[PDB]
């Protein structure tokens, strides 16, 4: 541990193009493992990791029926929120939810998540006490009052402390081996000439998993160059990730700069420099 189980929900109205797009995506430890999409040829919860293929038909039928119920509920709620905000009909709007649990290595709940957004802005969330709500505005206050009157927090807390934690335990047991996998980055430095006898040194990390990584450039043991260019970590398309970091240095000084690559897969951080052919 720690481990987490979270569902990311998206409902997008599209007047004139039929009923709203509706999707639910589940993650175990930030790895997608199940997905439902109303725009699939056959909308149904489907496994998104091979280890989920060990769940029998009852599981998929049950989860699919919940998704279909949630879909109908969010269809209503899109209309409701239009009313709360006195918005005109005919536009496309979005409700999103992040729902789930994080548990410690000892199996105890560390935190619960129930966060809503409307049109990409926070709307309502369950507080850390698992008992009260934070509403973002006067519209969300209406939902908050409905939920207080219905005892929704108590129902949700039962899910977060019970079902969510227990199913996470189940998923981890099936997916343990696969979830633990790491791929170490492979690194190299490239050299590019710039005007005024300057040089771009670019330190690449490729083929790594999971995405968390740190690249740094050092002159003389510092671990310290403030002004690098970095790109955001990006998916290679094969389940691994890429990143690079560059610095501009004077021609004739390239050999004094060192790139370090830090990743959980590595026995020790990588250290490399520009290797003149």
């Amino acid at each position: 541990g720690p481990h987490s189980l979270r569902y990311f929900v998206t409902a997008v109205s599209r007047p004139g193009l039929g009923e709203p797009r509706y999707m639910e995506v589940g993650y175990v430890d930030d790895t997608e493992f199940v997905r439902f999409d109303s725009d699939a040829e056959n909308p149904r919860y489907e496994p998104r990791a091979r280890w989920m293929e060990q769940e029998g038909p009852e599981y998929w039928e049950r989860e699919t029926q919940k998704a279909k119920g949630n879909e109908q509920s969010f269809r209503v709620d899109l209309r409701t929120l239009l009313g709360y905000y006195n918005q005109s009909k005919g536009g496309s709007h979005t409700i999103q939810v992040i729902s789930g649990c994080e548990v410690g290595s000892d199996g105890r709940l560390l935190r619960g998540y129930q966060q809503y957004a409307y049109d990409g802005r926070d709307y309502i969330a369950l507080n850390e006490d698992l008992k009260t709500w934070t509403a973002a505005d006067m519209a969300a206050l209406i939902t908050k009052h409905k939920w207080e009157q219905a005892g929704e927090a108590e129902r949700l807390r039962a899910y977060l402390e019970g079902t969510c934690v227990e199913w996470l335990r189940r998923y981890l047991k099936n997916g343990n081996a696969t979830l633990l996998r790491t791929d170490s980055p492979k690194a190299h430095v490239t050299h590019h000439s710039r005007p005024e006898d300057k040089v771009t040194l670019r330190c690449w990390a490729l083929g790594f998993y999971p995405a968390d990584i740190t690249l740094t450039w050092q002159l003389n043991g510092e671990e310290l160059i403030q002004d690098m260019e970095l790109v955001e970590t990006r998916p290679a398309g094969d389940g691994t990730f890429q990143k690079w970091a560059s610095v501009v240095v004077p021609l004739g000084k390239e050999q004094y700069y060192t790139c370090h690559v830090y990743h959980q897969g590595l026995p020790e951080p990588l250290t490399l420099r520009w290797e003149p052919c």
Binding site: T10, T94, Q96
Partner: protein
């Protein structure tokens, strides 16, 4: 709040002329979810382009990956063209094989 997409264009593996590869256009950090993404070869739209399934991040912004199999050459130029409600003009980002 609407958020404009970040865009990166790059290959799955380091480019080697004459060797099969994948050309990627990664769009992320945008809202709302509708987005148009084309891959271009010498200015022209590539027809066989696929994409990953839509996801969103903890900040409620969306991301996905558009991609096509390709074989880079010395002289062919590639780019990604993105349109989104936040953009006043479609944004074109050129592929540089070492970025």
């Amino acid at each position: 709040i609407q958020r404009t997409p970040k865009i990166q264009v790059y290959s799955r593996h380091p480019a080697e002329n004459g060797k099969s590869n994948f050309l990627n256009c990664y769009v992320s950090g945008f809202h709302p979810s509708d987005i148009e993404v084309d891959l271009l070869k010498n200015g022209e739209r590539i027809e066989k382009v696929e994409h990953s399934d839509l996801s969103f991040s903890k900040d409620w912004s969306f991301y996905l990956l558009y991609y096509t199999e390709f074989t880079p050459t010395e002289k062919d130029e590639y780019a990604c063209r993105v349109n989104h409600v936040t953009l006043s003009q479609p944004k074109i980002v050129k592929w540089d094989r070492d970025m």
